[PDB]
């Protein structure tokens, strides 16, 4: 599934991401735009053998079990396949664990390079 901007915003607010640990809702919408263009079925194979899954491109080296990533960890206790669902519930929940580390949204390179320091309110204009 490919969410529209306001569709994704609504879903994220319902699943508790507006002002989760100081990150206003637009930080998350912006993150999803540049990570995956709002596409829950996005995947990208990294050179080490891991894969980024889902709308927030969560990585199999640490966070989920895809069965084919060497020396990996599954911190979110979920199979990576569940991060390809249209329903974002399990991605949000794993994203919350990630962001609750000291590193914050630095976990997502695309947020750091293109969202951090900008006006993120724009990403929820008119929804």
């Amino acid at each position, epitope marked *: 599934k490919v969410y529209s901007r306001c569709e994704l915003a609504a879903a994220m607010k319902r*699943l508790g*991401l*507006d*002002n*989760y640990r100081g990150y206003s809702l637009g930080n998350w919408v912006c993150a999803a735009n540049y990570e995956s263009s709002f596409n829950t079925q996005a995947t990208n194979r990294n050179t080490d053998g891991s894969t980024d899954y889902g709308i927030l491109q969560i990585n199999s080296r640490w966070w989920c079990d895809d069965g084919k990533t060497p020396g990996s960890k599954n911190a979110c206790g979920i199979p990576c396949s569940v991060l390809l669902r249209s329903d974002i519930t399990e991605a949000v*929940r794993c994203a919350k664990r990630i962001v*609750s580390d*000291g590193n914050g949204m630095n976990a997502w390179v695309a947020w750091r390079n293109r969202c951090r320091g900008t006006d993120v309110s724009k990403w929820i204009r008119g929804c």
Partner: antibody
Amino acid sequence: DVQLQESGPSLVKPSQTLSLTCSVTGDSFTSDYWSWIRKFPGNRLEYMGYVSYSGSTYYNPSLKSRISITRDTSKNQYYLDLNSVTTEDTATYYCANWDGDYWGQGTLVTVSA
Amino acid sequence: DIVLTQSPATLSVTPGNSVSLSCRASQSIGNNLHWYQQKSHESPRLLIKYASQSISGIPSRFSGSGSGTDFTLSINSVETEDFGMYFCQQSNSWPYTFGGGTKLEIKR
């Protein structure tokens, strides 16, 4: 399975440091975040803080720089150091993992002269 | 620090009946509200996470609903074993905080 157990003294004198240890079974230690919670008399729960494998901690402001949470990853253990205790830190102390799935047994620490 | 208000402070119930427990938040916490059970001389046990999401091993008769500021824990067909304290807890904002708690006692 994942199991936790608190250890360390049950009686501490005012102004000394309260030093507790939580020992963890299994392989989850380096992949999870780890917490300390305490229960005061009157069923009052206070979330003291947690540590990630990243080395980063978050501590309750109410503890005013008295609290340290540290990891020893080679031994699957973590620690709580709480400086300059008073009678007000008398409580039951729990270790637990961040999502709340697994908890230790609680250990009652008394602070008194 | 977000304040969580649990009403009422105490319930007494005859087994077989139902109860609803309330937790109110002093600001919007989305769905970031979790529910615990604590029996005497025991550790808290997680019952519901993220307002409505169920936990493996926890009887189906426990459910949760709500969002924003108002949350509800339901226990359908209360059993004698269910007696003890019930605490809500938010993970929206640091520091994490607990409600003052609701005591469930058995009526005889």
